[PDB]
């Protein structure tokens, strides 16, 4: 279920309040 | 005030992003 690396993924094109919901740890 | 814009989140930009999001660990620190 989990992906590359989001800081650098997000770096390059972005992540909405989505991916970053699912990347905090809670 | 600004909504998923996805805009590019370069590791800090993705770590507030994150925060405002969800939150993260704790933030906390010196709180």
């Known amino acids: 279920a989990a992906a590359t690396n989001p800081a650098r993924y997000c770096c390059l094109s972005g992540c909405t309040q989505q991916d970053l919901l699912t990347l905090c740890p809670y | ?31």
Do not use: I
């Open chain 2, 1 to 31: 005030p600004t909504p998923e814009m996805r805009e590019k989140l370069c590791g800090h930009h993705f770590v507030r992003a994150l925060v405002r999001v969800c939150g993260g660990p704790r933030w906390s620190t010196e709180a």
